[PDB]
């Protein structure tokens, strides 16, 4: 007859013991010097996922019973108006536990500490209006395109040697579809022949397989036809050249007889076609509705500029192109002939979701930590200025900060205790741009980088890092749900 | 090696263990910024229900061998006639045991000691018509309203940062339900999102539901309709199977079928005029097309306890099968709508005609501890309601407690006799509670005990313990007073509850593996 | 412990420690201040229950492996007889055996022994008309009516702080019970809601239950329907199932049937005026609608002992079938309505014609405290029966047992041999009880019995123990006398039960391993 | 199968131990909530014996296994050139272990944590001259000559209630002390009896004898007789003071003549009397007349309260002089005694130091912000000991607050505020619960007992780390 039930210092316990351990995981992944962790299962999922962003990995599995998956689960809504840029957020909030041993010594109410959550607020006030931000942002624009923020989220990623250039090449690729709608309409493969430039930019969407060795190799004025039902021969050949139909593409497995028709005719088809190509190819070329052979005609809307097959100088490709609705575009990479190549699929990802907020929020803070350390010379005046019982809870909160300084340099290579020191007496100067520079292993100007951060992400982190710990104190034990 | 028999002065033991167990999870409560604990304990329980209100918890389990369970109990009759504001009747009879070791020092009749019980309506008497309380309650009434007993009970609580202006609004509650007949009908929910405000008045009944994406937004003049009986059709005496048959024409026959129960929804419905339907279970697909286009707004798996609330609310209804439409029900008419309240989504029933019943939201920021929330509204509802009733109340911040602990101690002495050590062990007892409202404030205790007594000795009434101050001050100022009722029956409550325990020592243990 | 076979001295120790256990536990349970306790088991023990009724405790659990469960049994029909007042045959019986070390000592036979209680019977006549005796109970009686012989058994219950004034109430029952009745029409209810009074006197029978919600609050010239059948009509040889039928055809019949018993009813009914219809068992749903209308209230499934209780009280009623009405009928016509109490719904009989018949309500919480209530009050009902019909009483407080035991002094000196050496020990076995209500008085021992015994040997039967005053005083201004019954039964059952136990040597079987 | 393994970081542990297990004794001891602890002790130790102050018991004896004995001796040195103030060096030492754990983590060279220590000398240094605190200490000083560092000293001690202003009375002896006359000459006791000011200063010496019943009550217009070897009427002699037995003969005479004469008077009394009275050439019984020289203001035996003392006052050098002290009589008294010596030290450096710091805690808190900043500036490895060496100080303020029987979490917000607004006035207030302006009060510390101070607690830190084992054995 029970579940949980736990006592003052014990209870207190559960909650510490879920802070450490997230914490190194993501300890690693903070920073242009992250690192990649894969995790290995055998049964129902199939393989190690490396899943470098930190949100990704705690919401996609609820391993054991220990409150910290709701807290978990909030992130979730930062990145929505935000997103990601590096994962700072649940750090900060795990090591304001470390000092609650601290509080047993208090021998008090640890209720009257909370006033500090209180105070944090107003520590988060002195990084809101007192660092960094940037000057215009006035659209499309010239050379403030990128080489900012894009290349922050990547520099985390170890591809980032000509993969910044990539990066580069996406806000292209948000200019086209900025404004309304945020972001999904957006396609993209690698490839395995190599360029300096790594990467090319295609007008529309691709796809990869093949009817049979047999069939044309280019259409125009393209017709498409999208089956639900898998493929008689005479229905589908009178109904079809009425049409001109250029290329039929179904969801499925596709019987032979057609096969050889589609070749002579002039019309290429598509066995076993992913289901979510056919859903943005529906948005792209107007759509349809798949019935049964009555199908071709009226019922079927095509997009008719350009659909061929094109030979990328390796792999075998197929490009849908032309699409009147605009809404949905692709990008085809090229490479230089590597298995980082593949690591480019996991970075494009990143980058047209962090373009898409910047475009929008019209605002940057200084990367590379440096935000991070300013703060920190700061917050240990503000425990002074508190009465008794806030300063005691807000000087822990100030500390924390100096977590960070380690953990970017330290996953650099170079010594952290020596990187600190260092770090904080340019910081205290008033220099917002200087920052760590972990390729040179001590600190310099992060400007001259082009490392910036969303103002958007820093702004949520702080106020999430605050009152999600302030809701486990409330708690003293959890969970819910019962039999019968 | 034993059978776990025992024997005179471990016996009385047990009794004593069982008020000492019960009274650490209950001090945490008493006083601002209390613990709030879950407690989930699986066979035929059916939620983890959180409660930092000692007498609901204590009531719903009876958990082992010694004796408590009988103590627990009787707070309950105390909670119909007032019962509430901090949980304290419980933890001043478990002091109570602590002096009976020197009990046996006191060589002599354990029941003359209970005399000191009987005594105690002395001194219940003694806390009545001594030392001014207060007066006031005219009527709806401007500032006097709250910021008083609601914020107290509330004080209690780690929330009144915020929370303090939730306690304020509970009296609006109170004002409307006024002059209609008692204390009835009060339910209250919390909002998943954050808001300075934290909390919206609705002016009626509110759900969590809806029937579908489709359906017009509000109803205005709306009947309702509560059905015990799902509008699922297909198992009944005769089976197909999970079938569809060897062509189109068959079918048909089963199709037919279906329309008929559609057909009489419609039919019934419009007449009536029709602007809601609440099922309290699964509901069949087909309705619902129809509902959408007639412009009907019907609820799926609706809660049982939601539906007995609202009946009372709407006038009532005989739930059976389809006849159940026309006359068979009686809903009541105003408005019905789903009402964007802040983040999430509700449903709200308002303008009941009846009015004996009404409804208070809370908001706060989105946690299971969310749910904290609950827990004060019916600590700040039912003592407004009484509140209004009582017409009497006395001061807060512990003010009464001190006074009334100078009036016994000088007492004792001078009645000579067996009865005055019993009398003067009640009288320090008064002692802990202003040690109490210091401690979970955030201040050292044994400096607020003794500055506390000399301001009282002094002679005036209105200073009290003063939580934010850390000493003491006017407690008029602050506004807390204390229901009048709660002070008659919590003093004559612990003395009942008290008296069978201490005479009560024979305790059965089974093994100690 | 630990290995045992039972032979000679040995296996009367065992019987020697078992009366022993057993008379501290029953010693508390003596006397205007006596002590209660509570007992905890599973398997059909709900809870802890608080017994202070020693035979009844006795009786319901055989907790451990010493001998006693035997003489325990016996009790049980001196209860039925007269039973209670204090339990104090049971402790005469333990008190027996501890000067049974002497008679180890003593060396001869001891059956021989055996002959001193016979020699008790002398005692016995001895105590014949020798002690006063009390001239009261002449019939209802004004003021001995109590404070008496109830009070006195209610001293060891633990309810005695409000319970005495109880008391006091159940003579008012019993002289309503004498002459013309029998032992019938008592019954008594507890019920929420904590008051000084604790309990209420009704002038007629109080029930629990209720036709439906609808029907009129207050009925007046009521007139009391009882029937022996229900109202129920159908199941008979062909019951099927309860039915809806194919469509209309078959199916009219048989409500047809039932519309007779519908209108028989009523027609029957209007005429007589009949405001309450109570029948025992189940009640017929069709007359329920037509009862509302009419203005009539009825109770489903009234109990059979409430309901013959209640035909004394109305006037009585031939119950036959549907013909019952008009003048077979005879119905009482003060008022019955449905009232309130604290909390749970109840319905009251009152202003009976008969006058021989009444109905006691008891207020309490619901705790098992107040179950303790239900069962206390009848022990006060079965003393009060008896004093009336004996017409012969003594004096309480130990006065009784200090006049006997100088007596019973002298006659062991006086008469040689053998006889002399098993009456003395019987005589100091009196002595144990003055000692015994002096220590649950709070006032030391050693001072009371010398004071005790210089009053008693001085001639005065009235004198004995008074606890409150800590020593000697007047018993008769007290107005505490014991019933002669309870004295004469405990000697002559006090003499068997010591027969049993040391009348044989050698118990043969049951082991650990 | 386990006799005893250690290497490198069990090494550590023992050391780790025994820092910690001396640390808990002695922190009791420190600040005005100190506490007395009873030891046992056999083989030429008697009974309990029981210490106030850490450095007198440590020193005494060695107990155990552990290593910590070659760390205590340090003490008594430092206690020799400057003293006690409170015992609190041991205990900064300590605390600095507890970051040894925090080191494991940082995971990079133990040993040139180690190369810290010498930043920690210049950190003395830097404790110096970044921050103000002294502005003082001019010459016998108006207001700040004492409520000074003393009080600070006594803050520790129970007495404080009245004893603060025996304190203050202090310097005004050192004052006369002062200059190259040397720190010899001051005698002190204490005595039982009623009024305000607790203690007398007095012109002359004090001594605590009497000849015997049958000699004179007083003596006026006093001849004072010293000789070097056991044992009139011209001279007008009033008393004899002899170090040494005095044979009986003479004593009848004594009695009868008018003279009050002392038996068995110490050596060291009479050397300060000498100073005193002009001085005598103590020789045979030729001794008398010139080569004796005497002061004669007043000799008089003076119940000063309950028990009678005689008293050497009106003495016409003026360079030596005695402190009477007061008490209310239990082994705490005797901690007058301890403090007494405690006392004198302060002061002597006082005078020629020429420099100071606020008292009552202001030096520390003060000190603590700064820091922080300086672990920054110098190179990062370097930094590490040095910032671990500044966040020790935040216990500092905590201790003086908790002993004061004031909430201690409250008093750590509001101190240091003050301290980062730049007044190094505002300190720790134990009287009134709060902080306060130590200006006002007049305490300020002595600029030795800071410089030593933190040498003393450097030096017991490293002995720890820089040495894996201090253990032997011998089985094989």
Redesign the interface.
């Known amino acids: 007859?029970?579940?949980?039930?736990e006592r003052?210092e014990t209870a207190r316990l559960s909650s510490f013991i879920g802070a450490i351990a997230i914490g190194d995981l993501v300890k690693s992944t903070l920073g242009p010097k992250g690192m990649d962790k894969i995790l290995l299962s055998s049964g129902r999922d199939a393989s190690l996922m490396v899943t470098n962003d930190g949100a990704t990995i705690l919401k996609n599995i609820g391993v054991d019973n220990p409150a910290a998956k709701?807290l978990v689960d909030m992130s979730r809504v930062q990145d929505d108006e935000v997103g990601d840029g590096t994962t700072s957020v649940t750090v900060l909030a795990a090591e304001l536990l470390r000092e609650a041993e601290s509080l047993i010594a208090?021998k008090?109410?640890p209720?009257?500490i909370?006033a500090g959550w209180?105070e944090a607020t107003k520590a988060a006030r002195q990084a809101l209006l007192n660092s960094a931000v940037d000057h215009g942002s006035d659209e499309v624009k010239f050379r403030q395109d990128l080489m900012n923020i894009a290349g922050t989220t990547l520099s985390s990623k170890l591809l980032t040697h000509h993969k910044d250039h990539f990066t580069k090449l996406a806000v292209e690729a948000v200019l086209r579809l900025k404004g309304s709608g945020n972001l999904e309409a957006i396609h993209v493969i690698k490839k395995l022949g190599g360029s300096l430039a790594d990467s090319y930019l295609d007008e529309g969407f691709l796809l990869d397989k093949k009817i049979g060795v047999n069939q044309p190799k280019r259409i125009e004025n393209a017709k498409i036809l999208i089956a639900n039902t898998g493929m008689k021969m005479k229905e589908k050949v009178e109904r079809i050249l009425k049409h001109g139909i250029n290329c039929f593409i179904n969801r499925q497995l596709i019987y032979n007889y057609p096969e050889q028709l589609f070749g002579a005719a002039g019309v290429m088809a598509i066995e076993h076609a992913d289901f979510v190509g056919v859903e943005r190819l529906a948005l792209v070329t107007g759509g349809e509705i798949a019935s049964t052979f009555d199908h071709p005609e009226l019922v079927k809307l095509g997009s008719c500029k350009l659909i061929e097959e094109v030979m990328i100088g390796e792999d075998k490709l197929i490009h849908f192109s032309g699409v009147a609705l605009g809404e949905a575009c692709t990008i085809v990479l090229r490479g230089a002939t590597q298995q980082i190549l593949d690591e480019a699929e996991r970075s494009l990802h990143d980058a047209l979701c962090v373009l898409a907020q910047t475009v929008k929020d019209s605002r940057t803070v200084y990367g590379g930590g440096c935000s991070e350390m300013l703060m920190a010379h700061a917050v240990?005046?503000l425990?002074?200025?508190?009465?008794?019982?806030?300063?005691?809870a807000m000087e822990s909160y100030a500390k924390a900060l100096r977590m960070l300084p380690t953990i970017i340099a330290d996953n650099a290579g170079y010594?952290?205790?020596?990187?600190?020191?260092?770090?904080?007496?340019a910081h205290?100067e008033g220099k917002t741009t200087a920052g760590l520079d972990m390729k040179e292993g001590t600190i310099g100007d992060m400007s001259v980088l082009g490392i910036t951060e969303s103002f958007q992400v820093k702004r949520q982190v702080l106020l999430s890092a605050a009152?999600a710990a302030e809701?486990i104190l409330?708690?003293?034990?959890?969970?819910?749900?019962?039999?019968?």
């Open positions: 007859a029970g579940a949980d039930e003052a709701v208090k008090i109410h209720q009257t909370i209180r240990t005046q425990a002074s200025r508190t009465p008794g019982k806030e300063a005691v010594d952290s205790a020596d990187l600190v020191a260092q770090l904080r007496a205290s009152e809701v409330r708690v003293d034990n959890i969970i819910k749900a019962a039999p019968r």
